[PDB]
Amino acid sequence: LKYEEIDCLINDEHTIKGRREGNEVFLPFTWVEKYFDVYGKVVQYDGYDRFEFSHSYSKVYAQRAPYHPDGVFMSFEGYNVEVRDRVKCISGVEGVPLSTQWGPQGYFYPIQIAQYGLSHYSKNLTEKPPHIEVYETAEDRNDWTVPKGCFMANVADKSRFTNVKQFIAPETSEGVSLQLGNTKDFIISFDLKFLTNGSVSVVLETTEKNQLFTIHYVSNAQLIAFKERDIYYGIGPRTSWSTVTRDLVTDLRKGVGLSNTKAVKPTKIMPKKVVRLIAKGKGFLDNITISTTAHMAAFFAASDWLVRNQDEKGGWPIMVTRKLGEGFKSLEPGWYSAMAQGQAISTLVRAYLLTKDHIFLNSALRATAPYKFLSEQHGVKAVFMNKHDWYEEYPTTPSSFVLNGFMYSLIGLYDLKETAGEKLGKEARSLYERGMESLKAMLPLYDTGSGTIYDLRHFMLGIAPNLARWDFHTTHINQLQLLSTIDESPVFKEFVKRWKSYLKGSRAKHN
Template structure:
């Protein structure tokens, strides 16, 4: 699972990012389920020679596309697995031991914690970091070697199985969510202290429970439950949604009236940031959960959020840039400068509104039209 360096340079496990990681790989599984896999290469076990620190080199017989360098293997302790790419003349080393070699412009060392360690990785990402340029050979011959003591091994090395790669990533994300949910509140608490922008007197709660994290995690666990029908997974979904409806852990009220699902809930219950994408992601998660496991109180909250969006969406239209969106409403709630959405967030707003338009298309035409209106309006700004 990914570690985030956002707000904390030494890294932390960020539930939003982990849920997005799992959802991304689920989407890729769905998209690629009907596509034929590229060639897959397997090595059952690679071990050092008895009287040698390293094994002989094992060569993949065909030239492979670097876009197909999905790898999966299990490596023992005190071992390093070396991949040498002929055409690009580079080497990637995945190691569970202290490596005394220094990284160079043609060598990258990826340290692995724990042993035996199961590795599921896309080598192209590591190659691009190493090369630091986009112009390199996109097809290459690869040879592989393991180094370590006589007990060292790399087992079930598989190269090129994108489906396996995406499956492992999906299950890793869901496993982390299941193992780290607070059973009492349902939250995945975030323990990174934050102020809001330059407002040192406005603090995000410590720890904080993000509505966006809860919604996206619920969406991911709904997809897991569709595969498992495991009641424990259903209970985890119910717990994930609980902070959205049963308390103000994740909520704020615009004009003290319209409920909003807060990505960054502040300590002060009378203040809110009203981040647009965070609420919409949480809203979609709420709909996913209620579609799977209908509850009257969730339907009521969904209707309340629709009413909120009807009243609040006009405030997200930029007052000075025609049909551009705002990231949040802090200029209203905190008298800040207008927080204009970046180009990427503007596209996210359009995509989320398109998704909601489609969700309500068959069940509530007027609500679908509401979202369509803002899709058209925000899209016109980039045409």
């Protein structure tokens, strides 16, 4: 009811307007929010309005079980790699993300590709099975339009023990068209083999004023184009049988948001109906499908990409310049990352456990080699103060000692040593053991008393600490709580507990 406006002098240098009722002073949240860097808003419920304050914005993952290498990967069941605006698109040829974080030109970032695979792996274990509608098997168990000038038939293919739909259509015609009409699901899948150049295109009804947009999957290696209401993805020659799987929601959003910058422009556009599929050129088509999700095809696109792109040193070279900050020498394209090696390993190990295909395990085993060589010999190892081995997310000179990347490097070694067995696992066992000793000793250097630091650049360069933003702080917690389920050391449990309290505004005691 009754109050009194009062001047509030802040640190003797700015005045704000507060309110007073007797002895109690009330300060405007507008100030509190900005001055303390906190969060809150009024939430309206039925018959009750309530202001709701948060020290931080991120959340910690509620672990349902101890970590195991064949299970979900940490909290990645909730990751969403493809909406990240630093993902320019999902490659047509490779079926994996292309990053633009550190250059508008685009590049395959092995970390991003592995996360793509591990998140989809994790959602395969946690989400409900998808609806799968089948539109075309060409067998004896929703028809096609064939304009004059074109042709279609059911033909056997002994190489792949099924019937198959042949199509011939000039690239100057309407093409041959199959009516789909799906309202609910947006993952399109089909087996394809071209004899000549061509395209397979999908018409979408969209939420932007009921307009049709068309996505063309063209038989070239061009990445992505967008003109008016046509989006084009190059999917390569596809002259041998392959299953093409695309997420039309993502393919539409990335097209419409195409940008010459490092970030996709935001869009609200969604597809509301998969109208039809249009084939041009000469070729063959089978098992045409629309599904709610296709997690496994994504996981194997990442896994296959990692196998095929590993170098003979066992590394995934990162083909972009990385400038970590004033004081660190710039990393020329080709550098390795312990986070990439670890995340790749976690991916390949899971591919191996699913398939028993030893090419996956062989790729994983090779991937430990860079952990053995120092950064200046094109490895990822750094040594803290001539005493503790570390595996560098960014193998900088001087060394950088990024915490979260290191922990990811260790979870990979863990995945591998538990999967390869006693003899084959030896090197990974040894790198893990040395790493975990380093981690336990060095954790306290990342603890500010009300947060965490991202890296040790303050010490390595003589500068301000690089405080970890809250989404890295919760990553730190997520990583440590996972390690606490496969290593019984008290230190991990104590730090997890303290670092969680920091999310709620707890502080270490001052003297």
